[PDB]
Amino acid sequence: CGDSTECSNLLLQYGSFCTQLNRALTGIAVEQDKNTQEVFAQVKQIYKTPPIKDFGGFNFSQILPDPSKPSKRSFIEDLLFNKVTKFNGLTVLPPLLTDEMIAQYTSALLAGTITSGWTFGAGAALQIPFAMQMAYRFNGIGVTQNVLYENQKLIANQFNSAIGKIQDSLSSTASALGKLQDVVNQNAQALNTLVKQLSSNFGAISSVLNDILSRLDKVEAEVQIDRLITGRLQSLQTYVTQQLIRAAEIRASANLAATKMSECVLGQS
Amino acid sequence: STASALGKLQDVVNQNAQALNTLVKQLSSNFGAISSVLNDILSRLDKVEAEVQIDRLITGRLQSLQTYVTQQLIRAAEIRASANLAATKMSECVLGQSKRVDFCGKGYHLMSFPQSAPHGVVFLHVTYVPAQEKNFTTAPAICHDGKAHFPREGVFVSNGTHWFVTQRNFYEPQIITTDNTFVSGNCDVVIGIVNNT
Amino acid sequence: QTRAGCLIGAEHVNNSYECDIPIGAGICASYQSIIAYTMSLGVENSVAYSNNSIAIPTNFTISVTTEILPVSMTKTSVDCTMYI
Amino acid sequence: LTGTGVLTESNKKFLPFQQFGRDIADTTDAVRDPQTLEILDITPCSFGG
Numbered sequence: 001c002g003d004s005t006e007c008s009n010l011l012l013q014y015g016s017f018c019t020q021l022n023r024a025l026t027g028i029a030v031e032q033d034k035n036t037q038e039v040f041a042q043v044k045q046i047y048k049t050p051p052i053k054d055f056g057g058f059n060f061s062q063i064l065p066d067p068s069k070p071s072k073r074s075f076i077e078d079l080l081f082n083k084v085t086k087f088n089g090l091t092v093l094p095p096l097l098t099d100e101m102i103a104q105y106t107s108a109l110l111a112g113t114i115t116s117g118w119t120f121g122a123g124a125a126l127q128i129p130f131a132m133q134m135a136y137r138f139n140g141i142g143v144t145q146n147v148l149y150e151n152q153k154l155i156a157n158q159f160n161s162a163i164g165k166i167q168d169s170l171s172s173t174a175s176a177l178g179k180l181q182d183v184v185n186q187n188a189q190a191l192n193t194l195v196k197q198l199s200s201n202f203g204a205i206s207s208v209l210n211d212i213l214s215r216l217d218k219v220e221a222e223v224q225i226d227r228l229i230t231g232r233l234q235s236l237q238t239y240v241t242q243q244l245i246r247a248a249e250i251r252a253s254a255n256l257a258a259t260k261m262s263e264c265v266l267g268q269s
Numbered sequence: 270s271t272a273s274a275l276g277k278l279q280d281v282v283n284q285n286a287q288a289l290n291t292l293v294k295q296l297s298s299n300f301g302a303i304s305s306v307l308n309d310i311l312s313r314l315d316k317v318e319a320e321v322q323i324d325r326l327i328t329g330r331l332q333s334l335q336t337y338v339t340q341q342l343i344r345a346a347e348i349r350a351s352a353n354l355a356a357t358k359m360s361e362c363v364l365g366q367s368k369r370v371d372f373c374g375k376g377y378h379l380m381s382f383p384q385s386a387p388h389g390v391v392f393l394h395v396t397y398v399p400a401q402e403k404n405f406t407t408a409p410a411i412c413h414d415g416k417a418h419f420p421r422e423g424v425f426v427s428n429g430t431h432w433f434v435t436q437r438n439f440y441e442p443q444i445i446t447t448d449n450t451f452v453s454g455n456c457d458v459v460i461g462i463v464n465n466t
Numbered sequence: 467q468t469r470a471g472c473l474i475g476a477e478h479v480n481n482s483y484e485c486d487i488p489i490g491a492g493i494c495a496s497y498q499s500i501i502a503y504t505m506s507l508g509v510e511n512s513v514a515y516s517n518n519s520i521a522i523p524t525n526f527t528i529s530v531t532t533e534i535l536p537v538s539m540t541k542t543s544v545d546c547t548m549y550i
Numbered sequence: 551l552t553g554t555g556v557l558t559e560s561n562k563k564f565l566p567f568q569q570f571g572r573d574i575a576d577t578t579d580a581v582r583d584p585q586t587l588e589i590l591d592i593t594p595c596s597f598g599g
């Protein structure tokens with residue numbers, strides 16, 4: 001309608017479509033916070049790594065949080081953030097969890113899984129040196145722990161070189177994060193075409209309510225307004241249905257992600 | 270005693286009831302017609318004109334019905350996914366012990382029991398959770414006569430004077446003998462080798 | 467005034483609790499005169515990590531938990547002539 | 551042209567034959583006054599939830 005008494009009166013007797021639309025949108029909006037909470041919020045407490053860093057020769061400085069930065073985001077996170085790239089009744093609501101607490105959950109996970117191991121996923125976190133957690137993790141793929149302790153330095157160097165190569169590949173190669181960019185583009189174009197639909201006659205003499213109201217009388221404008229209302233309602237319904245389908249897909253993906261992080265981070269799948 | 274522990278099933282039932290109720294209530298709407306009752310608009314009117322009003326009512330009701338069907342379809346897909354997960358839990362946790370972490374209960378899994386519920390299932394998961402920790406002191410390998418010895422299965426600990434081998438999830442000390450140790454090379458490469466007998 | 471807008475009828479505090487009514491942008495409220503504040507991710511502890519220390523449990527407990535899964539809904543049929 | 555909003559000064563420039571500008575969905579963003587001949591931009595009044 002956009003601030004029209006006549007339009008509100010005409011829309012009133014169209015049942016309760018608007019209530020259903022708002023309810024569906026609110027449900028799918030709550031579902032996002034539900035997804036984020038059920039993914040990240042796996043740990044009862046928040047852990048912090050000790051300042052003294054000596055993990056048997058490995059090096060995690062590029063993935064641990066950097067206290068210098070105000071956001072406490074690790075280097076790889078900053079590279080990722082740099083890699084990835086009006087008002088007509090539609091609004092965008094902020095997420096419940098901001099970036100800083102998300103970073104803190106990631107840091108807590110990443111610092112528990114370094115010193116405690118997998119035990120912090122079941123009961124209370126139990127300290128254990130990293131060079132022995134690797135022996136335990138070899139012992140789980142049919143390779144005896146005999147191998148590791150003669151190859152500590154070679155394995156450490158290979159790990160450092162690999163992580164550096166990952167850093168360089170992420171920094172240089174573009175479009176390495178196509179999936180997230182695709183999701184964002186899909187949402188943006190859906191909103192954009194929904195906005196653009198407002199300039200369609202739909203059979204009416206014009207695409208602006210105020211002008212046809214101001215140029216006509218309140219007997220004949222009825223039909224034109226009705227055509228506009230039904231067309232716009234159809235478009236909005238279509239957009240809502242598409243949103244529902246995409247939300248179901250994203251929920252499936254988030255369930256997969258939660259399973260992956262529960263199985264591979266908190267233990268050896 | 271504690272209610273509100275069964276939110277999911279109650280929510281499902283309420284959603285179905287609300288959808289049905291609003292579908293029924295949609296009959297009373299006018300959809301731009303002159304009234305929401307067919308008989309009166311038929312009686313008060315004549316032939317070639319009331320047809321338009323009846324068409325308006327028909328198309329409005331048809332749109333409402335299609336919307337209801339689509340919502341039903343989406344909910345059915347969701348319930349199908351949930352039931353597939355339920356069947357998986359039925360198959361691999363009830364009929365056997367599971368290894369994947371945090372799939373059936375928090376902690377190391379022991380078993381499950383199924384119980385019915387008006388439109389679903391209730392799993393009682395019996396799990397295992399340790400407690401009452403200590404510290405002790407660790408060394409990755411023990412070399413006797415210059416050659417290393419790794420434990421066949423367990424981990425090395427000590428209480429200050431005597432070294433012991435144990436398992437990973439329950440404090441249980443044992444003296445060390447060849448029966449639970451195996452040799453590999455000589456102790457000059459591993460970082461953490463400590464003397465013992 | 468917050469990042470998500472503003473609150474009228476609430477009084478800000480500088481504490482940290484695991485809140486129950488999420489407001490948004492990290493801010494969230496509680497009753498206790500209604501108050502709003504910054505949520506606490508949890509009680510933060512530091513594991514006394516070193517390279518030569520472990521923590522072996524000496525006792526155990528058995529806990530019986532429950533979970534609930536819907537499996538189906540009611541089966542409905544609708545006519546066309548009778549309804550429309 | 552009937553509208554409702556808040557008027558403010560527009561720093562843009564119109565061509566002499568230009569009358570008013572719009573950007574998307576027939577949003578008349580800037581308008582020149584018919585008497586004094588200056589362009590002021592229109593922004594919608596504040597709304598929220």
Ligand SMILES: *[C@@H]1O[C@H](CO)[C@@H](O[C@@H]2O[C@H](CO)[C@@H](O)[C@H](O)[C@H]2NC(C)=O)[C@H](O)[C@H]1NC(C)=O
Binds near residue numbers: 058059061062
């Ligand atoms: C761990 O990795 C970091 C990052 O690469 C290292 O820090 C850099 O080390 C190089 C070589 O020592 C220096 O030229 C850089 O100036 C360092 N950068 C910063 C920001 O400190 C760090 O030395 C590595 N540490 C270990 C033990 O491997």
Ligand SMILES: *[C@@H]1O[C@H](CO)[C@@H](O[C@@H]2O[C@H](CO)[C@@H](O)[C@H](O)[C@H]2NC(C)=O)[C@H](O)[C@H]1NC(C)=O
Binds near residue numbers: 402404511512
């Ligand atoms: C093992 O001993 C350590 C100390 O060597 C104990 O560590 C405590 O950790 C908490 C958590 O940060 C600190 O508040 C205490 O001050 C530490 N105690 C000290 C330094 O004496 C630890 O509690 C002991 N037990 C276990 C299971 O780790």
Ligand SMILES: *[C@@H]1O[C@H](CO)[C@@H](O[C@@H]2O[C@H](CO)[C@@H](O)[C@H](O)[C@H]2NC(C)=O)[C@H](O)[C@H]1NC(C)=O
Binds near residue numbers: 428429430431
């Ligand atoms: C560490 O554990 C060992 C194993 O029990 C203890 O050694 C025994 O200690 C008892 C009590 O003093 C004596 O009666 C036994 O004769 C000891 N046996 C041996 C083989 O030494 C030891 O006392 C413990 N030490 C500490 C510091 O806890």
Ligand SMILES: *[C@@H]1O[C@H](CO)[C@@H](O[C@@H]2O[C@H](CO)[C@@H](O)[C@H](O)[C@H]2NC(C)=O)[C@H](O)[C@H]1NC(C)=O
Binds near residue numbers: 461518
């Ligand atoms: C565990 O870490 C500590 C601290 O880095 C190591 O202790 C150092 O060991 C070197 C090698 O002999 C000495 O030069 C230092 O003086 C020691 N410092 C302290 C504070 O103890 C220890 O060697 C490491 N142990 C293992 C098994 O990795």
Ligand SMILES: *[C@@H]1O[C@H](CO)[C@@H](O[C@@H]2O[C@H](CO)[C@@H](O)[C@H](O)[C@H]2NC(C)=O)[C@H](O)[C@H]1NC(C)=O
Binds near residue numbers: 462463464
């Ligand atoms: C374990 O004991 C052996 C021998 O008992 C040590 O090996 C040598 O011991 C002699 C006698 O004290 C020293 O002079 C040498 O310097 C030792 N060699 C080396 C390479 O250390 C060995 O050092 C002992 N290791 C530990 C961890 O106690």
Ligand SMILES: *[C@@H]1O[C@H](CO)[C@@H](O[C@@H]2O[C@H](CO)[C@@H](O)[C@H](O)[C@H]2NC(C)=O)[C@H](O)[C@H]1NC(C)=O
Binds near residue numbers: 524525526
């Ligand atoms: C392990 O924890 C259990 C749980 O409390 C302890 O069992 C209790 O032990 C006390 C002392 O004998 C009894 O009075 C209680 O009746 C026991 N609980 C139950 C439910 O029977 C057990 O003692 C602990 N074991 C150790 C070695 O500390």
Ligand SMILES: *[C@@H]1O[C@H](CO)[C@@H](O)[C@H](O)[C@H]1NC(C)=O
Binds near residue numbers: 477478479480
């Ligand atoms: C505490 O909260 C009050 C009100 O929210 C605020 O005025 C004050 O600056 C905060 N900090 C301190 C140290 O009082």
Ligand SMILES: *[C@@H]1O[C@H](CO)[C@@H](O)[C@H](O)[C@H]1NC(C)=O
Binds near residue numbers: 585586
């Ligand atoms: C428009 O005409 C009125 C009436 O004569 C006059 O007062 C006003 O100054 C004129 N404005 C301009 C811009 O010429």
